[PDB]
Design an enzyme around this catalytic site. Sequence first.
Site, mmCIF file in Angstrom:
data_model
loop_
_atom_site.group_PDB
_atom_site.id
_atom_site.type_symbol
_atom_site.label_atom_id
_atom_site.label_comp_id
_atom_site.label_asym_id
_atom_site.label_seq_id
_atom_site.Cartn_x
_atom_site.Cartn_y
_atom_site.Cartn_z
ATOM 1 N N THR A 165 19.464 -43.675 -17.749
ATOM 2 C CA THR A 165 18.103 -43.256 -18.196
ATOM 3 C C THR A 165 18.236 -42.273 -19.363
ATOM 4 O O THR A 165 19.107 -41.387 -19.289
ATOM 5 C CB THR A 165 17.298 -42.646 -17.038
ATOM 6 N N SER A 166 17.403 -42.443 -20.392
ATOM 7 C CA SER A 166 17.231 -41.500 -21.528
ATOM 8 C C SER A 166 15.734 -41.246 -21.723
ATOM 9 O O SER A 166 15.002 -42.212 -22.015
ATOM 10 C CB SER A 166 17.870 -42.020 -22.793
ATOM 11 N N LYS A 200 8.992 -45.943 -17.549
ATOM 12 C CA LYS A 200 9.391 -44.612 -17.021
ATOM 13 C C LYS A 200 8.377 -43.557 -17.474
ATOM 14 O O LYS A 200 8.498 -42.401 -17.028
ATOM 15 C CB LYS A 200 10.808 -44.277 -17.494
ATOM 16 N N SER A 204 20.794 -39.395 -17.763
ATOM 17 C CA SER A 204 22.254 -39.544 -17.982
ATOM 18 C C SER A 204 22.562 -39.637 -19.484
ATOM 19 O O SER A 204 23.540 -39.008 -19.929
ATOM 20 C CB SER A 204 22.763 -40.742 -17.235
ATOM 21 N N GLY A 205 21.734 -40.359 -20.245
ATOM 22 C CA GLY A 205 21.949 -40.605 -21.683
ATOM 23 C C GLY A 205 21.681 -39.381 -22.548
ATOM 24 O O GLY A 205 22.000 -39.436 -23.740
#
Lengths: 221, 211, 204, 222, 233, 195, 195, 196, 196
Positions: free
Chosen positions: H1-2, H33, H129-130
């Site tokens: 996910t970013s 998202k 995470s990104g």
Amino acid sequence: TIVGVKFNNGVVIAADTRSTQGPIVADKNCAKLHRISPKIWCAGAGTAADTEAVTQLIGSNIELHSLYTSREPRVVSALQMLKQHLFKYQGHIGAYLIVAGVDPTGSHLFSIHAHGSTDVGYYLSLGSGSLAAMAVLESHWKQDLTKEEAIKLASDAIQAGIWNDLGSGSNVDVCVMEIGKDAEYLRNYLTPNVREEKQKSYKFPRGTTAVLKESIVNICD
Amino acid sequence: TTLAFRFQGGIIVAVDSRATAGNWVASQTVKKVIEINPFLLGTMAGGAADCQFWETWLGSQCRLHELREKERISVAAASKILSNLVYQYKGAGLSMGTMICGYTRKEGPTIYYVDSDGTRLKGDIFCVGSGQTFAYGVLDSNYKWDLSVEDALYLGKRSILAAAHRDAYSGGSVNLYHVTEDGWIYHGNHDVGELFWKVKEEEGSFNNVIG
Amino acid sequence: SDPSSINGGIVVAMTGKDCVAIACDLRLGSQSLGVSNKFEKIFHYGHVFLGITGLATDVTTLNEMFRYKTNLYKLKEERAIEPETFTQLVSSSLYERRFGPYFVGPVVAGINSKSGKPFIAGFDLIGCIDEAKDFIVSGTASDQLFGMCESLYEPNLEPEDLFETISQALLNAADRDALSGWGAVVYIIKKDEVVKRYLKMRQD
Amino acid sequence: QFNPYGDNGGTILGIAGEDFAVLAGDTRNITDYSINSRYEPKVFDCGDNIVMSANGFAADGDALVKRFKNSVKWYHFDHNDKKLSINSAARNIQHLLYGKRFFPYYVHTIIAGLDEDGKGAVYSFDPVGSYEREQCRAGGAAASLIMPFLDNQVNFKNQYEPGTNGKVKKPLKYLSVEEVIKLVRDSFTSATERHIQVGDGLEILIVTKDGVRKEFYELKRD
Amino acid sequence: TQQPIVTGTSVISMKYDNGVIIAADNLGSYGSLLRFNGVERLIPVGDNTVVGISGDISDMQHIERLLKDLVTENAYDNPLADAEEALEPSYIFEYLATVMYQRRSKMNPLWNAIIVAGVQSNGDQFLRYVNLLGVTYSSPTLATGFGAHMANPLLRKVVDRESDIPKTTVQVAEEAIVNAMRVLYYRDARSSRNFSLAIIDKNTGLTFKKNLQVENMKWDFAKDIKGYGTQKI
Amino acid sequence: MDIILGIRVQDSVILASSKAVTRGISVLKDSDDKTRQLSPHTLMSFAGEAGDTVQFAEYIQANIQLYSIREDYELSPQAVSSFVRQELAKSIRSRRPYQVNVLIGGYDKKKNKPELYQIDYLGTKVELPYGAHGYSGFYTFSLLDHHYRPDMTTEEGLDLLKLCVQELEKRMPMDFKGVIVKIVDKDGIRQVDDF
Amino acid sequence: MDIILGIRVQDSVILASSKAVTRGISVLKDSDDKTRQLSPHTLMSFAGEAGDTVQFAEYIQANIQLYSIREDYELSPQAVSSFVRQELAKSIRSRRPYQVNVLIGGYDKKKNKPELYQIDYLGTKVELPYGAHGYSGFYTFSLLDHHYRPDMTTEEGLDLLKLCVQELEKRMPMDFKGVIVKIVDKDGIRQVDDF
Amino acid sequence: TSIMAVTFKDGVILGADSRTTTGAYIANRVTDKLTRVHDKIWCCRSGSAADTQAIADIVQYHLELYTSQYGTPSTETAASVFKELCYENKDNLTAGIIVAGYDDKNKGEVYTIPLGGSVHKLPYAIAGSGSTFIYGYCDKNFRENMSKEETVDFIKHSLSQAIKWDGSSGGVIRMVVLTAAGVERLIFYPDEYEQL
Amino acid sequence: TSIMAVTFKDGVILGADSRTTTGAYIANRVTDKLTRVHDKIWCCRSGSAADTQAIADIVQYHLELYTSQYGTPSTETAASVFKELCYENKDNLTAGIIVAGYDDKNKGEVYTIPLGGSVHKLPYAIAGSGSTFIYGYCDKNFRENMSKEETVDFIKHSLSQAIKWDGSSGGVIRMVVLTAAGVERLIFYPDEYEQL
Ligand SMILES: *C(=O)[C@H]1NC[C@@](C)(O)[C@](O)([C@H](CC2CCCCC2)NC(=O)[C@H](Cc2ccc(OC)cc2)NC(=O)[C@H](COCc2ccccc2)NC(=O)CN2CCN(C(=O)OC(C)(C)C)CC2)O[C@@H]1C
Ligand SMILES: *C(=O)[C@H]1NC[C@@](C)(O)[C@](O)([C@H](CC2CCCCC2)NC(=O)[C@H](Cc2ccc(OC)cc2)NC(=O)[C@H](COCc2ccccc2)NC(=O)CN2CCN(C(=O)OC(C)(C)C)CC2)O[C@@H]1C
Ligand SMILES: [Mg+2]
Ligand SMILES: [Mg+2]
Ligand SMILES: [Mg+2]
Ligand SMILES: [Mg+2]
Ligand SMILES: [Mg+2]
């Protein structure tokens, strides 16, 4: 293997008919396509009892809701009730569901995971055979499928699961939910795994089995 | 379940014929007695491979002894080759419960119990295996030194049948041996399938079972 | 420490022409030790037959519980429970204990007294219904039973033929399982008579 | 942590006639829920009228069969082209398996051929070299499904003579090659229906004094 | 006992009427980090064999070195090194299989899944798989990692049994391979858009295509997806 | 605890129970009665986890005595056994289960039949001609399978028991300090004062 | 194994060793001699891990017998004990140590003294008036502390031993099937044939 | 996910990728998202999909009931409701949420709620995470009071990099523009952002 | 740790921070992570300080003996010696090494050897805990054939960001310039790079 595919005037869900206990096939023709309400149908993967039990509980509560409100049940209600229930139990209720149907709002296709996460999509697959089925969906799916194209794509996606996944086999079950009309449930739509005729009859000569005692059982009053 | 006992008329050796893979029944018709020579018997209990390999190996070592010494090996010496071998492997995970039964002129009829812990015992009565306690119960409560060859053969057979019934990990058939000064004599295979019903009827025992 | 295989035992059910058969072994053990030679695993409530394999305390408990529920059913409904309905009662009752299950493999057999149709079903310990036209198997030798049934079975067997098939299926499956056997019982169930036979089998 | 073993599934079956023997195996190779191959043979002619299958972990099976084939080749060299009898093969394989007693070959091994009297012979081994001669045996994933059926239909276990009141047993008699192949084809179609690791194809090697013939049959591919 | 550090994902391959095709992406992953973006995982050996490698890249680079050293050793005291005594795909495979099984047996695996693709001197298609366990199998279609789950089902729709191979052209077979690489890019989080593809044909020999890209991707339907259930805007 | 046996003969049930109570490397006592009379014609022997055994027996005894007073009537052995089983079947899914195995030996005055019930701590009930809990059964079941006859007298029953105790004193690793023997027949419960 | 005792009196050492050999819930044998004569005036009793006990005893016996033949002379009990200790002290840091405890009872002909040496599997040696290995010591040491006198005869020594065996048969949980008793004095080693 | 939220002159823009993974398998490649808890209060979700969906649903409930009684809630009030749920249930929740909103008094505001349930008001926020891969890039390129077009570019370039390096991120770049002018949904496809 | 090597027109530049930590404690704040294995072959070290020092010492030994026999080794040869040590001993080593060198034929070359002992020839390489934060930044700002001043800036800005976000990185930015003109050591202090 379970799939859902959206089309112009509705949504179609399909499933294989294999039930397994470890590496053994328990049921060669189980029905994984469940009715929540007349025009909202459910496809279930995961712990077999959990998907049947959670589908029946929400199906019961949806029926009572429909009677209370004097309205056709909506898919978003089935979705919200399932997700909140699965969430409360923090994944211990191992239910993975593709929820599809038609209501006054239109046609809907959703996936629910055991922990209570939901997804929107035009095509979805779930279960051990989901990767085999999704390869076919990602290869053939286009926007603006006809009814007949959506049924073919869905059954093709299940066949990928039957052939290439050891977790899936036997027959293809389809449910077509079209806006305006009655949902049609095509039980054993495809039957490409008929057992070949056996080489022999194992029918025994009568009196082969050795018996110690007989008695009439009384089932009467 | 395996058993060997000493009496007036020599040694009786009786074994069942079952091989297990956990709760799977691998075989009902397996040999658990190795005929090392005409005066020497080995019984097998524990790991199937461990027993078969090391007891046929024992037979090779016993043949070499009589080549280099021009004389049959003593029951004591034959048992101590097997006990000294398993002791070298102690902790490696060998699983073996064996009886070396035989007659030599200097010893007389002799039974040695040998196990994979390295225990070696001379004695008159032994029962070895999952079903040993069942075999002991029947054998110990009917055993005299003065049993006739005929009675001792039956008690041995009846003690393995007892174990075959109660122990889930014993059964199939009873294999019988009699060891005298003239060597071992085979007294046949007896399927529990037929033997149980015949013994029940003729002996009037096993009233626990739906007749 | 595997509840389903402490005591041992098997149940199998088959459909024939206008008849059903349900059979069980008689062994109750504590692992290697055979304890009882007469522990029957098939019960009946009216004309509906229930077989239970698994942990013996739960076999006894569920029988006592279903006798209780089908007694109250009969008093309120003023008729005996039917096999289709009982199957659903078993399923509800097992899934009620979802996070503390009974360690059992129940098998339902019977003839619907109105339609005349033969009926069998089986369940996992938490309530999932396997309904099969042909046969249902349960217990420590379920692999062996699946093997035997799938070869031996053919559809539309007369009661006296069906007896030979179910008997041979159970007998030869039990002989390949340490924790099953020690005697067997076979119920041949027709529309309005039930014959119960004790099979002679190897006692090891 | 590294696990040196795997399960490649499949199932094998050997039966002994009076003057013949069969070793049958499915041609399916799996890991977890994937099909690796629908036709990967695991029953091999090893020379000297011996056929062999080592079912389980495929890598260990291939290693063992290779080592036995090599064992036969050196037996010829070292013992003036003498024929390796089935009993002598059996004992040799015990030593091959027992060599890796503390890091075993994870396989169920069956060999079939004719004994030195021209009779049908089947030997079967545990992973660490235990062995026994028998009239018939199944190995691998579906062993538990097929074996009790073979006890019933090959050795006539639990079958009695109609109207003898369970006192006279059905009499043991040798089967024709035609009958043995019927039992094998039905054993495998039954195994295929109920076991997920069994299917795709069936391959049978038949051994007579005239050599090794091969028969193949389609199985359900689901 | 190791754990793989820098890894490559799926290698996919299939047989057609005349030869074999094999393909693999040009990514070296470092867990979730898409670390290295120019990694060749198809290594050609002579003009009749391509070895496609997935798993640990350090172990792959070791296997490259073993193969280039093998071609060298084969040429030694070998006047027919480029003729009847050239390395066959079956020779190269059996060598790698032998090494893979020895290393697993020393409890020190080469942490890889390998497909050896090529054509034998007698014109026969060669396609066989070996992995860190020394497990080996052949099929008209083979794939590693996600490839086995998503590529095989698509490639098996073209060649389902042996008898389908003569009926499959290099056009059809290459099309199936390129499509299967697009699916893997959609659905594999350890995959990349850039890949290599190799055809070994019994007439046209070895064709090696570098810097291919996944094309004709369907993304437009994404704009119509709002929220995760009840959200309308 | 360890050793408890039961043999049902023609006209009586015989219960034999080991006298040893041991904690660590000390035999604390060598005359322990591992039995409670539940009703005049029903006796329960018990073995298992320290403390739990007596607490369970006495609780069951209280409940049967209460029933007897309330109804001025003696529960059948079948009824007492079913009550005990259900208590154990409850306990096994409790916070801390009763770790007690029991034999119930009773004379049913209505049927004029002796009855032996073997029940384990899971609530596993069986009616048996002879029974045992613990390691005892590994020796006594096969021995009784051979020597037991259904029509034996009480004196033959006691001789069959001597065989069992002789065998256990020969082959059992632990010193269990002999058995206390009790007979349940149509005239109630009595104890054999030397064995 | 389990029970091995030793009492050194005025003119002898007395070794008492249990006869039972047990594996699981089976007493395999009830007449086991847990002793090897090392030399005519030196006896070693042993207890510990199955297999290791006999293998160790016989190895020590071979080495002492070899020394006797080579030097045509009998090693003093002090010398044999020091040899045995060193062997155990070596074993404890081996790949697989000998798990054997020993008593060495010897009559030293030069000093005309009986000697008892207690040695554990770590190679812990002590010279003692009385000694025991295992759970036995927890009962026998305090008992001997009270009843033992340094100047006792061999007959008094055997009576002191009866006290010890009586106490162990009373309070020990396991049936050890009595003891074999051996006396080591100036005239060598003899066994008491009933105890 | 970013995921990121960036304040600018006219309001705030929310950005996210569209990739959801179960291990290495992309369970959904067109995930949304960017989720609405009020007309002009949105959040970006990162963590357990179950946990962030359940939280977002409860917050939407609280804010709809807040509106019924006291009218439009402040961005701060929305962030405070997220925090309350995240903090009080920290032991059972894996949720990293960015809350972005537009009041007409307060203009564009961004609040980040990391795993602990702490609250941080920021000019812009990045998470998922990104995000690790673009801290350097975002710190160097962010300026206060950017235009709409500049802020759309900043997010597009930023998430483009996060997607390129993070295997857990990918698919389309979704954005949501929050200003006085209302609510605008933007989508940017691979074939555009990849070769920036 | 934050380390990088960048090829440019005239050769290659190695950059590193100067911080070494035992947990949260800065054991040394003026560490030299730029280490010479040959006149114009240098490496950047990341991982166990013991392991990378032991490896670098052994490589310097091999290259000094190589020189004695066959003259100046290639950058590729030096990378191959590092790889041999790192790959063969992968189970006992925690070493991430960037090898940078200047041949007069081959110009500036950079090889990265990550934890596995794989080798990657790259135009530029970044490594160390602090590198995660500048992947986005470095990918966007790197061009081939930069000048000396441009490449010095690129490294200074890049490590400046890595230091800002990584607690394990900090202190001074050390650089080593490798060209035909010889060998140049550069140092840049906090008070300079912090407020870039
Ligand atoms: C496509 O992708 C396809 N793949 C096949 C498959 C098998 O994966 C499946 O998901 C099916 C779908 C169900 C078919 C039946 C209708 C409802 C959906 N799932 C199963 O078959 C599951 C497999 C499964 C999944 C998850 C598990 O986690 C434990 C286990 C097994 N089957 C069952 O659960 C199985 C059903 O038994 C049928 C049956 C009927 C009659 C007699 C016997 C058996 N039962 C069990 O697994 C039993 N298991 C025991 C222990 N348990 C458990 O929770 O233990 C406790 C103590 C914690 C309670 C769980 C259940 O279909 C997809 C679509
Ligand atoms: C009487 O008391 C009776 N009890 C019955 C029985 C069965 O217990 C037995 O001991 C028999 C006797 C032997 C029969 C063959 C002739 C020689 C005597 N024992 C067995 O049948 C053993 C049981 C057993 C015992 C101890 C074990 O400890 C590990 C295991 C098993 N059976 C086998 O060993 C069994 C035989 O083949 C089964 C089989 C068949 C086909 C496929 C798979 C298995 N095989 C195995 O146990 C195989 N197993 C391999 C791995 N292994 C192992 O140790 O591996 C490692 C990784 C740990 C190294 C152990 C063995 O007879 C007595 C008298
Ligand atoms: Mg949660
Ligand atoms: Mg048995
Ligand atoms: Mg049985
Ligand atoms: Mg199949
Ligand atoms: Mg990506």
